[PDB]
Amino acid sequence: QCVKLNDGHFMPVLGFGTYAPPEVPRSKALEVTKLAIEAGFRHIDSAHLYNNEEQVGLAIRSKIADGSVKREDIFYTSKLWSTFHRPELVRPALENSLKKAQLDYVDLYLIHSPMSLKPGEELSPTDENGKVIFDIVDLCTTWEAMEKCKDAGLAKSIGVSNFNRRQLEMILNKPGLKYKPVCNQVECHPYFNRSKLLDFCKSKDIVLVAYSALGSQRDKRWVDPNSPVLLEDPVLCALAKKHKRTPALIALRYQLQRGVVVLAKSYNEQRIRQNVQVFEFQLTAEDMKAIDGLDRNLHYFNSDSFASHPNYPYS
Ligand SMILES: NC(=O)c1ccc[n+]([C@@H]2O[C@H](COP(=O)([O-])OP(=O)(O)OC[C@H]3O[C@@H](n4cnc5c(N)ncnc54)[C@H](OP(=O)(O)O)[C@@H]3O)[C@@H](O)[C@H]2O)c1
Ligand SMILES: CCC1=C(C)CN(C(=O)NCCc2ccc(S(=O)(=O)NC(=O)N[C@H]3CC[C@@H](C)CC3)cc2)C1=O
């Protein structure tokens, strides 16, 4: 149940979301990644930013050692954080991710965001007035250093995340481009379906990968508590009854039938196991059109300095 990527590698269409907020103890990530593998998830999504690659990597090593899976059955993604965009910082950031996860390679490596930040080991560097310190970096150079990580076998595939059309084109039109991005991982759900962006990506053999596909985790630090609750949508609930499924399952299947690869985060055993049931049913053409008409251009993630920057993808 995979899609063939533009560099010849295979990406499982359903992936496990590993982020949890810092109030959740780091042992949980270990434990739920193991349950997700047990349930049948083979694609696993992490990042430097998430402070969990050690635990996610140890979960994977555990499922290999107990003979449930081999390394080559597992599709593991990490991301290059925006403090490491300068070309010389790229390979060491990747080697550092690999060392924490105790893996020899990632299956996929992404530029987490086009928005560059001040080099350092602060995740969020700020000045004396508490303002986020942005950096200016030619992203084409950052890309060339990603290409080099693929040539070196440290990343089987390389792609981007949180890019708009203009930013993709900048990579695609780069002189001497060796490797296209395999994918563009972006916020994508029935209230923000990204249809234009999706058609652009289909036209270049770039896979759109959907995050917050179930309506985000609604963390009060960066999601407006007044935003509508995706899984409480009436059209989705009505479709969950029709098919005898749940609204989350309607949300996930939507993305599969439109050719989006879809991530799903759950730290709850029963919801982890429920989510692999996306493969057990179909939506009709009409069902698909009913979900299409839910778009509200609603992004869950919002920051005081994100909606500000010269590389802000929504501007
Ligand atoms: N590239 C980027 O910038 C970026 C940004 C955001 C996210 N991501 C990635 O995308 C992943 C997923 O996105 P997300 O973290 O925003 O969460 P999500 O996949 O939209 O899920 C949101 C919530 O839905 C709940 N849930 C899951 N399955 C369910 C079901 N079957 N029924 C009812 N509720 C269900 C989960 O809560 P429970 O834990 O209570 O089950 C979860 O907190 C992340 O973990 C991360 O790996 C990447
Ligand atoms: C505005 C961007 C930014 C800084 C500047 C510093 N800083 C940061 O220190 N983080 C705090 C921890 C956190 C926040 C959200 C999530 S998240 O929303 O679950 N996961 C994601 O991967 N991506 C989010 C982060 C990247 C942006 C572009 C898209 C959404 C995971 C972890 C940021 O976030």
From Swiss-Prot:
Q: Name one GO cellular component term.
A: cytoplasm
Q: What is the effect of changing R221Q?
A: Decrease in the retinaldehyde reductase activity. Exhibits changes in both KM and kcat values
Keywords from the named record: Cytoplasm, Lipid metabolism, NAD, NADP, Oxidoreductase
Indicate the annotated site residue(s) for Involved in ligand recognition and product release: W222, F301
The record's active-site residues are Y50
Q: In which pathway does it act?
A: Steroid metabolism
* Tissue and organ expression note: Expressed in many tissues including adrenal gland, brain, kidney, liver, lung, mammary gland, placenta, small intestine, colon, spleen, prostate and testis. High expression in prostate and mammary gland. In the prostate, higher levels in epithelial cells than in stromal cells. In the brain, expressed in medulla, spinal cord, frontotemporal lobes, thalamus, subthalamic nuclei and amygdala. Weaker expression in the hippocampus, substantia nigra and caudate.
Instruction: Give the enzyme class.
Output: oxidoreductase
Q: Where does substrate bind?
A: H112
Query: What Pfam families is this protein classified in?
Result: Aldo_ket_red
Q: Which GO terms describe its molecular function?
A: 15-hydroxyprostaglandin-D dehydrogenase (NADP+) activity; 5-alpha-androstane-3-beta,17-beta-diol dehydrogenase (NADP+) activity; aldo-keto reductase (NADPH) activity; aldose reductase (NADPH) activity; all-trans-retinol dehydrogenase (NAD+) activity; all-trans-retinol dehydrogenase (NADP+) activity; androstan-3-alpha,17-beta-diol dehydrogenase (NAD+) activity; androsterone dehydrogenase [NAD(P)+] activity
Site for Lowers pKa of active site Tyr, residues: K79
What is the purpose of this protein? Cytosolic aldo-keto reductase that catalyzes the NADH and NADPH-dependent reduction of ketosteroids to hydroxysteroids. Acts as a NAD(P)(H)-dependent 3-, 17- and 20-ketosteroid reductase on the steroid nucleus and side chain and regulates the metabolism of androgens, estrogens and progesterone. Displays the ability to catalyze both oxidation and reduction in vitro, but most probably acts as a reductase in vivo since the oxidase activity measured in vitro is inhibited by physiological concentration of NADPH.
Protein name listed in UniProt = Aldo-keto reductase family 1 member C3
Protein source organism:
Homo sapiens
- The record's gene field reads AKR1C3
